[PDB]
Amino acid sequence: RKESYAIYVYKVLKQVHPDTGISCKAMSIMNSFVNDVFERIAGEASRLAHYNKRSTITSREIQTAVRLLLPGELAKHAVSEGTKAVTKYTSA
């Protein structure tokens, strides 16, 4: 009961590299990275909601936080990823 991100990072690793392992320190670094990106995007979306006098955080605020924080092709590819995930989640 430690509430980590290790199993999902492991499944993503088996998606991109099915025959590659990962050490415990590298897994801790990946968990810290996911937590850092989560709190950056959530803080930017919270600030965006407060700037526009909105009481809710929607996918638009998350999208704007992604386009604000992520640079270059990372931003547009993450927008395409999140957009098609939201489209798949809505239709079904």
Partner: protein
């Protein structure tokens, strides 16, 4: 006079000359002057007391006497130096 004090004051000299030379070799430095080492010790002491003061403030907020690794991580994070590998 065999008796003396238990405390030690030259613990900044424990960061020796070859350690600073190795740290400069990792930084890609070819030639090092002799006055580099005292300046490096002063810079390291200033950085260490800046981090340690914030970590101790985080420790006394939690009503503790033990400086955990998470307090060091938060102290480094607040000044803009995020460190991975200890927050999980």
């Amino acid at each position: 006079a065999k008796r003396h004090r238990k405390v030690l004051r030259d613990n900044i000299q424990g960061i020796t000359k070859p350690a600073i030379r190795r740290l400069a070799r990792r930084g890609g430095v070819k030639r090092i002057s002799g006055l580099i080492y005292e300046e490096t010790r002063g810079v390291l002491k200033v950085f260490l007391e800046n981090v340690i003061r914030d970590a101790v403030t985080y420790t006394e907020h939690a009503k503790r006497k033990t400086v955990t690794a998470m307090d060091v991580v938060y102290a480094l994070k607040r000044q803009g130096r995020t460190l991975y590998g200890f927050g999980g």
